[PDB]
Subunit: 86 residues, 2 copies
């Protein structure tokens, strides 16, 4: 089921992001998050965490990304929805 | 939540979308095309592009010849890479 898998992937991402920003330990989290961000061209679960993440933990955001554009760009949840919806 | 399970689920979802996409001929096509564009791949295996109607129907990323696909990673690998952090 599309919806369930989308939910699961978004949840997985959320976990990875929480770990990534909160604790430098759990080292895979950063990699997972950075690849999710690079793959989907986003920087957060929301524009708030995208904004919060683009600043202060920029090392895991895409290169071409203005902080103010992160405020307008789609979050990763939206991009995941887009991924699974087509 | 579990990385392996979700990866399995996403790969399965993709497989379904791909089967529908190629065996038909329409939202399957969109899902598959976006998966392919997002992950830069064209099949569940290196063989699909070779045996299925993916290449025509314009379902592959730009400039993706049959040759290249045989030496590029399939979508399953890219999904694994996505969820593993590679």
């Amino acid at each position: 089921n599309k919806d369930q898998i989308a939910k699961d992937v978004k949840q997985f991402y959320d976990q990875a992001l929480q770990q990534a920003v909160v604790d430098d330990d759990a080292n895979n989290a950063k990699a997972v998050v950075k690849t999710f961000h690079e793959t989907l061209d986003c920087c957060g679960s929301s524009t708030l965490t995208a904004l919060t993440t683009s600043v202060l933990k920029n090392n895991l955001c895409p290169s071409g990304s203005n902080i103010i554009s992160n405020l307008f760009k789609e979050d990763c949840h939206q991009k995941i929805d887009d991924l699974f919806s087509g």
